[PDB]
Coordinates of N, CA and C and ligand atoms in Angstrom, one line a residue:
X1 N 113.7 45.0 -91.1 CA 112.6 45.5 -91.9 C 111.4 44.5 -91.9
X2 N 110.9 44.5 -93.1 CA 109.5 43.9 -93.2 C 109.1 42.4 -93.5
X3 N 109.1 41.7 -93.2 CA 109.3 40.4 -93.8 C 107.9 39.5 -94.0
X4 N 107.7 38.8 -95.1 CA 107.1 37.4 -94.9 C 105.7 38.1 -95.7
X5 N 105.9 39.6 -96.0 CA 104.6 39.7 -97.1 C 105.0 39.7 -98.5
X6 N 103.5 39.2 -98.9 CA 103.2 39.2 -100.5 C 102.8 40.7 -101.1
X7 N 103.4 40.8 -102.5 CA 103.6 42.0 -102.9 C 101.9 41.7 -104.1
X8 N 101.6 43.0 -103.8 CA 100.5 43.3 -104.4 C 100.9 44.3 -105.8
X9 N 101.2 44.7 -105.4 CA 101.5 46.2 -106.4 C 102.7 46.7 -106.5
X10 N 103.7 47.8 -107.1 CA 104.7 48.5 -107.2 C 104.5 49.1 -105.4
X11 N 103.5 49.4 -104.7 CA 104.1 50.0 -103.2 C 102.8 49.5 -102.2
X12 N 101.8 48.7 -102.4 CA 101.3 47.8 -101.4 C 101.6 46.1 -101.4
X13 N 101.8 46.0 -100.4 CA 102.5 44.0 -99.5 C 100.9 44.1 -98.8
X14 N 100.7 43.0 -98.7 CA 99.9 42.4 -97.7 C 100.3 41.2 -96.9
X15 N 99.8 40.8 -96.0 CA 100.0 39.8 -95.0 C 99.5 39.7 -93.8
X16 N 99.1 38.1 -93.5 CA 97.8 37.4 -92.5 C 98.8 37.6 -91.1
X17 N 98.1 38.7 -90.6 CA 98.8 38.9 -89.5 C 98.1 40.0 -88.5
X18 N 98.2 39.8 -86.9 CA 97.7 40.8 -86.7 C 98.8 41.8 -86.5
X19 N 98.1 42.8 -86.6 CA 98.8 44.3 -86.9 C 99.7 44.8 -85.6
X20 N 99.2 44.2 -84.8 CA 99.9 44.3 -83.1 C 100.7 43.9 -82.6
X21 N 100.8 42.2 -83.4 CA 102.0 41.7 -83.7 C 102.6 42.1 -84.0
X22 N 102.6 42.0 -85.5 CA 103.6 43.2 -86.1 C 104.2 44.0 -86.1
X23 N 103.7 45.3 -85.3 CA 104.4 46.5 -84.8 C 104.9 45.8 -83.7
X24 N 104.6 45.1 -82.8 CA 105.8 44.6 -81.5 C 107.4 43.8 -82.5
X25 N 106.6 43.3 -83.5 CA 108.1 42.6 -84.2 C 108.9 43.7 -84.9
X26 N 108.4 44.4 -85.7 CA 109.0 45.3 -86.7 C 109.7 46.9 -85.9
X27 N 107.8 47.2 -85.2 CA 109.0 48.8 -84.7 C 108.9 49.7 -85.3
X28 N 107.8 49.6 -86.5 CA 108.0 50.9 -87.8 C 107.8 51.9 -87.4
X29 N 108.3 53.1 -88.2 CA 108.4 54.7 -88.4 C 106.9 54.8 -87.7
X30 N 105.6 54.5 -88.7 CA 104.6 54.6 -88.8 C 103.5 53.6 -88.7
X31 N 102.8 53.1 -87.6 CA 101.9 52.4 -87.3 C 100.2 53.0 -87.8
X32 N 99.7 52.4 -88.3 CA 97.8 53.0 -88.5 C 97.1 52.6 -87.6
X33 N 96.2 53.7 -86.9 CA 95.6 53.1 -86.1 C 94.0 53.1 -86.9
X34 N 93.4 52.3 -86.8 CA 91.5 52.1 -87.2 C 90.7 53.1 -86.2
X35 N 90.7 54.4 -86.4 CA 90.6 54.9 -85.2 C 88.8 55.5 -85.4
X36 N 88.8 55.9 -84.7 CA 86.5 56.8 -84.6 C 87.3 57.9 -84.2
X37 N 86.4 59.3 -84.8 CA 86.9 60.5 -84.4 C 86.8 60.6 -82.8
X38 N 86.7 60.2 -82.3 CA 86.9 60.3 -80.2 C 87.8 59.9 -80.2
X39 N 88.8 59.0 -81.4 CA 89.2 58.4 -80.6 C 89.5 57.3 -79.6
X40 N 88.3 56.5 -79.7 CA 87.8 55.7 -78.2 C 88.3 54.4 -78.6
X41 N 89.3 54.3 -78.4 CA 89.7 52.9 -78.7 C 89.4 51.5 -77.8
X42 N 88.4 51.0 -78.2 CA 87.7 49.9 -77.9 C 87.8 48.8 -78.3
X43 N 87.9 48.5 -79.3 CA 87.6 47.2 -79.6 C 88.3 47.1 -81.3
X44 N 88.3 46.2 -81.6 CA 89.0 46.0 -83.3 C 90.8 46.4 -83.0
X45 N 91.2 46.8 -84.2 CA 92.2 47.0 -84.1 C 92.5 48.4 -83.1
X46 N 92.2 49.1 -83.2 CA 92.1 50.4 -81.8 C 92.4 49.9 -80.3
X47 N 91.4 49.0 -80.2 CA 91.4 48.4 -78.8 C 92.6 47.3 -78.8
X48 N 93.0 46.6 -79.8 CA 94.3 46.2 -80.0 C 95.3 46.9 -78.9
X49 N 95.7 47.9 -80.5 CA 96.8 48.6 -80.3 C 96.8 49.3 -79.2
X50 N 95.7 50.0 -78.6 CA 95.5 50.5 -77.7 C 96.4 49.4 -76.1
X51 N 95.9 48.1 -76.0 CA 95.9 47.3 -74.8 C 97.1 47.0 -75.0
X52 N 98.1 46.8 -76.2 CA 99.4 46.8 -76.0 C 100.4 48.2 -75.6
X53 N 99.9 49.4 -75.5 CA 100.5 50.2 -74.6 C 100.1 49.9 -73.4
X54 N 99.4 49.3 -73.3 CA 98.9 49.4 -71.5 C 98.0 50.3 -71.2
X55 N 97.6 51.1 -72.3 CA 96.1 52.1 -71.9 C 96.8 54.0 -72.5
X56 N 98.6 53.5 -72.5 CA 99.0 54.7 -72.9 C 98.3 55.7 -74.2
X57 N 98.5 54.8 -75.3 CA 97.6 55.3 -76.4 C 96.2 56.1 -75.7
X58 N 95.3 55.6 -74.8 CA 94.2 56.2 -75.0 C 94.6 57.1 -73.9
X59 N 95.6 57.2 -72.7 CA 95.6 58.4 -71.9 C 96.1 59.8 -72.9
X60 N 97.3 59.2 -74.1 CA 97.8 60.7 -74.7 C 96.7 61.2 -75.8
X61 N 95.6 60.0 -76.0 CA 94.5 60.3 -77.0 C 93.2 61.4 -76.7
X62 N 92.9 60.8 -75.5 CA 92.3 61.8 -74.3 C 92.8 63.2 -74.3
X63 N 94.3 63.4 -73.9 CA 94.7 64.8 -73.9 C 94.3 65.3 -75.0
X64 N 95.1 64.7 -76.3 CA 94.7 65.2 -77.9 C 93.4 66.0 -78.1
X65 N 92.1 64.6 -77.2 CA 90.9 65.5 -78.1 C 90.0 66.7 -77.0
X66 N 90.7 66.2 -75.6 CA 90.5 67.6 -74.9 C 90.8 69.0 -74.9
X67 N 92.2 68.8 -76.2 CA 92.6 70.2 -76.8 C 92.3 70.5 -78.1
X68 N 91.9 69.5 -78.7 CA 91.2 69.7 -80.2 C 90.1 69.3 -80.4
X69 N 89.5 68.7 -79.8 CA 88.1 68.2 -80.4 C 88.3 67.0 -81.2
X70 N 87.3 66.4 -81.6 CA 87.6 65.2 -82.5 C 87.8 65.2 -83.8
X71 N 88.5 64.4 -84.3 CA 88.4 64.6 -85.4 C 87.3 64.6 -86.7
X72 N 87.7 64.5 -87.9 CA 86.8 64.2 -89.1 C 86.8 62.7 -89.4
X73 N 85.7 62.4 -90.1 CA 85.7 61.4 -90.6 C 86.5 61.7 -91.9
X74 N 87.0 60.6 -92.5 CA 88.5 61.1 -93.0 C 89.7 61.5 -93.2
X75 N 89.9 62.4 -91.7 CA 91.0 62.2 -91.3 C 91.9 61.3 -90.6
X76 N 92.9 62.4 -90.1 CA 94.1 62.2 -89.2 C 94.1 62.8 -88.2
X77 N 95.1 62.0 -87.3 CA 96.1 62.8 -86.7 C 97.3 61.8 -86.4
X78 N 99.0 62.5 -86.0 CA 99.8 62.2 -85.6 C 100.2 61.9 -83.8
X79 N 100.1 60.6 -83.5 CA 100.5 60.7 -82.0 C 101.4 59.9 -81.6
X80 N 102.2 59.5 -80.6 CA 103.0 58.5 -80.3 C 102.9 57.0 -80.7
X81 N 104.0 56.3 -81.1 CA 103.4 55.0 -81.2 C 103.9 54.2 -80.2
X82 N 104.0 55.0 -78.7 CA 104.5 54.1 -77.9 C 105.7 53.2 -77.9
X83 N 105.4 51.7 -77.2 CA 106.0 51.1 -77.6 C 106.4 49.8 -78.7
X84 N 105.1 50.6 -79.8 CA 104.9 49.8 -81.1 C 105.6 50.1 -82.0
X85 N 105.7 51.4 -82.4 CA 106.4 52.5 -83.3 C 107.0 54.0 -82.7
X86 N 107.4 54.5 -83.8 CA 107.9 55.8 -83.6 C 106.3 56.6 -83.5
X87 N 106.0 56.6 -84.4 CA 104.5 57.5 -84.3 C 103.3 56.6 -84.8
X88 N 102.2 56.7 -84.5 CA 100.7 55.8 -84.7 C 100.2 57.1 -85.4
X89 N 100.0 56.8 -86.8 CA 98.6 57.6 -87.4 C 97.6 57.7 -86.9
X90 N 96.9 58.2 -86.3 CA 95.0 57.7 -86.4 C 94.4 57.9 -87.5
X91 N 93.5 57.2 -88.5 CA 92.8 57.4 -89.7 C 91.7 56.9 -89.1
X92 N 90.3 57.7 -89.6 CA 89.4 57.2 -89.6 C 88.2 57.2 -90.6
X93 N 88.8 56.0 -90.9 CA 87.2 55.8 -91.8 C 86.2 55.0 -91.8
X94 N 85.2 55.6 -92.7 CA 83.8 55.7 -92.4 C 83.6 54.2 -91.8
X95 N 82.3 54.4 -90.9 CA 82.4 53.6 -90.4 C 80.3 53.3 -91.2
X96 N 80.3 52.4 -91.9 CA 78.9 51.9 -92.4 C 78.1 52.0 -91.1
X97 N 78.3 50.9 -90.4 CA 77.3 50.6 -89.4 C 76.8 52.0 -88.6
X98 N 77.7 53.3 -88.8 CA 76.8 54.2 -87.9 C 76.5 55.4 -89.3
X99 N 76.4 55.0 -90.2 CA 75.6 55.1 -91.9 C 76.7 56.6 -92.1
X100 N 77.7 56.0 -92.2 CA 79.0 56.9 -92.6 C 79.1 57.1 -94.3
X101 N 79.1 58.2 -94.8 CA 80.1 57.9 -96.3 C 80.8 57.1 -96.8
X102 N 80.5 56.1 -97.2 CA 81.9 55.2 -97.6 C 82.7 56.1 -99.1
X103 N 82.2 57.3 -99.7 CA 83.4 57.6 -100.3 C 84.4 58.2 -99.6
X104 N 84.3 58.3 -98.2 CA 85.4 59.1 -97.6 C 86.4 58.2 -97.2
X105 N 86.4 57.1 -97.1 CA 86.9 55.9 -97.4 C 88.6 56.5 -98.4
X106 N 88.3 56.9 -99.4 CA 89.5 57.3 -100.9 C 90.2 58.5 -99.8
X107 N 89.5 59.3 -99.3 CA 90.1 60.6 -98.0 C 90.8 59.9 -97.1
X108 N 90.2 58.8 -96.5 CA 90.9 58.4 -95.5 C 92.2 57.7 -95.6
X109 N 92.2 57.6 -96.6 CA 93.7 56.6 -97.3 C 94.2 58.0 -97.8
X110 N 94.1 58.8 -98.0 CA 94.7 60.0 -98.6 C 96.2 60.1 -97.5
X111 N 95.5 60.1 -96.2 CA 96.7 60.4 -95.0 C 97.7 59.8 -95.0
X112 N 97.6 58.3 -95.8 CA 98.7 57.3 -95.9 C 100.2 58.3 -97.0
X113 N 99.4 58.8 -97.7 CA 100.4 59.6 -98.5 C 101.2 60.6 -97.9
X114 N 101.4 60.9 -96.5 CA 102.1 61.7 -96.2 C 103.1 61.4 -95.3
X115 N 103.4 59.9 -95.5 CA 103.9 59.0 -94.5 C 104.8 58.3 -95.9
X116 N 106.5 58.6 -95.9 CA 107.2 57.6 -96.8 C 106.7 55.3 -96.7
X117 N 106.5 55.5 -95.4 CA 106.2 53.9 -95.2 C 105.3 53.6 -94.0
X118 N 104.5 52.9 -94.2 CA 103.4 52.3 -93.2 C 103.3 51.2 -92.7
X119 N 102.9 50.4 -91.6 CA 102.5 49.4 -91.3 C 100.8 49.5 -90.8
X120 N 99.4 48.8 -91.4 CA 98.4 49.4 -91.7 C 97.6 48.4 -91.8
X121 N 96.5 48.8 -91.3 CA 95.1 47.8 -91.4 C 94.2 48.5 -92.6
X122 N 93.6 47.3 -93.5 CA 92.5 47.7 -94.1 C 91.6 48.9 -93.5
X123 N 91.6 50.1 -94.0 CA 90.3 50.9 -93.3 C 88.7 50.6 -93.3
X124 N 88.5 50.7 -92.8 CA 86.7 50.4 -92.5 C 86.2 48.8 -92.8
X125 N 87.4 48.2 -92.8 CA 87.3 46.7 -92.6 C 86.6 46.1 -90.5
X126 N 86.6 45.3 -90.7 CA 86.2 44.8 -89.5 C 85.1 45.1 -89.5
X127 N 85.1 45.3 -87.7 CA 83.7 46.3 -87.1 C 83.2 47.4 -87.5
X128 N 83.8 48.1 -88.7 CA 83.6 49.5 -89.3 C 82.6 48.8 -90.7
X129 N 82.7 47.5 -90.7 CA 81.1 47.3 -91.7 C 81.7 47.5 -93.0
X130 N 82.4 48.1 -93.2 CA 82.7 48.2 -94.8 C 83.4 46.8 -95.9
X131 N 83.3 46.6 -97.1 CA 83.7 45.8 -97.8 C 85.0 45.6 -97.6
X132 N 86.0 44.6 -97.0 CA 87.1 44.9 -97.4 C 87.8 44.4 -98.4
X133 N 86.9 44.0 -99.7 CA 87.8 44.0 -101.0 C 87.6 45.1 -101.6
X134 N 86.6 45.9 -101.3 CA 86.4 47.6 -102.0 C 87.4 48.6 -100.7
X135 N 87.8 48.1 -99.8 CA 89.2 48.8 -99.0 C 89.8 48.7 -99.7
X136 N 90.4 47.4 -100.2 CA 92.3 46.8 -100.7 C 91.9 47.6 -102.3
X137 N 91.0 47.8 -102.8 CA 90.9 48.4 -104.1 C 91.2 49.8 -103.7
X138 N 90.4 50.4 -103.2 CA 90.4 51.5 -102.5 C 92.3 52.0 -101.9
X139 N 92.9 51.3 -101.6 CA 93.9 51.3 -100.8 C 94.8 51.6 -102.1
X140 N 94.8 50.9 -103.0 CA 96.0 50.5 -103.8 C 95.7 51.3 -105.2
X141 N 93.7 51.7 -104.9 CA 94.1 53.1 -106.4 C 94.3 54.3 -105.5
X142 N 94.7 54.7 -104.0 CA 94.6 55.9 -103.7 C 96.4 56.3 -103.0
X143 N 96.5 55.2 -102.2 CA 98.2 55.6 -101.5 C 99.3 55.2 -102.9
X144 N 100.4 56.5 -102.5 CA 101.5 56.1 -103.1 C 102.6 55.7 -103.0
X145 N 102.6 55.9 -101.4 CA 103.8 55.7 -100.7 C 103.6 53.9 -100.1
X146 N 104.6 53.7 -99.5 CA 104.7 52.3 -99.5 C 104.1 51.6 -98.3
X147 N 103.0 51.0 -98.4 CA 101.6 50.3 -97.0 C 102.0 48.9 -97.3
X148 N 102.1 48.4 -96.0 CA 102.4 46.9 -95.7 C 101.2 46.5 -94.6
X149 N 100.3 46.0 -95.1 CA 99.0 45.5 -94.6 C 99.0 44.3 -93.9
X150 N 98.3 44.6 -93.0 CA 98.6 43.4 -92.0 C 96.7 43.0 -91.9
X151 N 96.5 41.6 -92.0 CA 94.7 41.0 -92.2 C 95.3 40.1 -91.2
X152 N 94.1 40.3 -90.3 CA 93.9 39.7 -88.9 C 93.1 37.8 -89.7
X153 N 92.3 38.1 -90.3 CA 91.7 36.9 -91.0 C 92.1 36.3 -91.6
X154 N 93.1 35.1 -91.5 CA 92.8 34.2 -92.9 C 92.0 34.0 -93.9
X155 N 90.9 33.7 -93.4 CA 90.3 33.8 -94.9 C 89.9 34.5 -95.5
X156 N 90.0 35.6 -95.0 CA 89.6 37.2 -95.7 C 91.0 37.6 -96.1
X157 N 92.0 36.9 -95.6 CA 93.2 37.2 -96.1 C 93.3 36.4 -97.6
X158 N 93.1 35.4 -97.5 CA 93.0 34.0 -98.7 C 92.0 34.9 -99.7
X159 N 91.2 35.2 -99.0 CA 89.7 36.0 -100.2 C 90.2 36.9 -100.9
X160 N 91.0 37.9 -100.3 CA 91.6 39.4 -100.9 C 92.7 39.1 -102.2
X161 N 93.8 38.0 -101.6 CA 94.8 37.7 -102.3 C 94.2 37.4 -103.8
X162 N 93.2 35.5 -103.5 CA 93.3 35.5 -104.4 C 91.8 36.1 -105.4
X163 N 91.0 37.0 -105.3 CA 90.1 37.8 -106.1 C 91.2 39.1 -106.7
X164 N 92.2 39.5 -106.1 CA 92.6 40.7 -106.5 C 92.6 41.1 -107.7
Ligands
LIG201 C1 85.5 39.2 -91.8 C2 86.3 39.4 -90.6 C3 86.4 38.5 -89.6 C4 87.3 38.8 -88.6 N1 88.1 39.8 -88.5 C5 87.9 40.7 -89.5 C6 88.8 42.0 -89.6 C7 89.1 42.5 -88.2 C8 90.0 43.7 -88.3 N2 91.2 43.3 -88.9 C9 92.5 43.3 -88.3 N3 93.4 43.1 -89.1 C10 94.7 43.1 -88.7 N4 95.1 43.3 -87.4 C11 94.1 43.4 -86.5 N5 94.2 43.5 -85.2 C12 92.9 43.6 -84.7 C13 92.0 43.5 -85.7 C14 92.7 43.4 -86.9 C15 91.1 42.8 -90.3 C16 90.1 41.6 -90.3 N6 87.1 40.6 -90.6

């Protein structure tokens, strides 16, 4: 199982770690990906998770939005998690810098609820511009099911913990 995080709440852990790690150590049911409705996994955690399949993630991602189109801001979707997990969520939220809704932000954490247990990045943290102490707020008044967060930053990890 999960080891070496700090318990935030009755069903969110947090821990300074990257998320890619992680999923190569752990293996969980459910991995989050930080995903843009394309899909285009580039860079942040996307482009992560993405380079540890070897590129698989974006070839079965590709097929996905060639038969559906992209998604919503605020959504999901369900796809392989390769050789990280059983299945990779994609959630995507808003992303500030391209002048996104940040209340869709509470939507995009909605998807976490449909998943008994997660392994999960702050949404619209990073390159997505967004606050991430109004994420971990955001995170922990909206999922109910059980999210084990993984912060690539130290000191944004140190910042989160201790303002909480
Ligand atoms: C203020 C600041 C500075 C540097 N980095 C960050 C973010 C980057 C995204 N991120 C991640 N957290 C966990 N596993 C991950 N893998 C790849 C990215 C990633 C959370 C921290 N914010």
């Amino acid at each position: 199982s999960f080891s070496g995080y700090l318990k935030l709440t009755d069903n969110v852990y947090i821990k300074n770690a990257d998320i890619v790690e992680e999923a190569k150590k752990v293996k969980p049911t459910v991995v989050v990906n930080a995903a843009n409705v394309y899909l285009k996994h580039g860079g942040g955690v996307a482009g992560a998770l993405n380079k540890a399949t070897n590129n698989a993630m974006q070839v079965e991602s590709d097929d996905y939005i060639a038969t559906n189109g992209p998604l919503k801001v605020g959504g999901s979707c369900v796809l392989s998690g390769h050789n990280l997990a059983k299945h990779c969520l994609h959630v995507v939220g808003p992303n500030v810098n391209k002048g996104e809704d940040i209340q869709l932000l509470k939507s995009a954490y909605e998807n976490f609820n449909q998943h008994e247990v997660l392994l999960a990045p702050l949404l619209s943290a990073g390159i997505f511009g967004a606050d991430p102490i109004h994420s971990l707020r955001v995170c922990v008044d909206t999922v109910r099911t059980n999210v084990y967060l993984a912060v690539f930053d130290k000191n944004l990890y140190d910042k989160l913990v201790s303002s909480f």
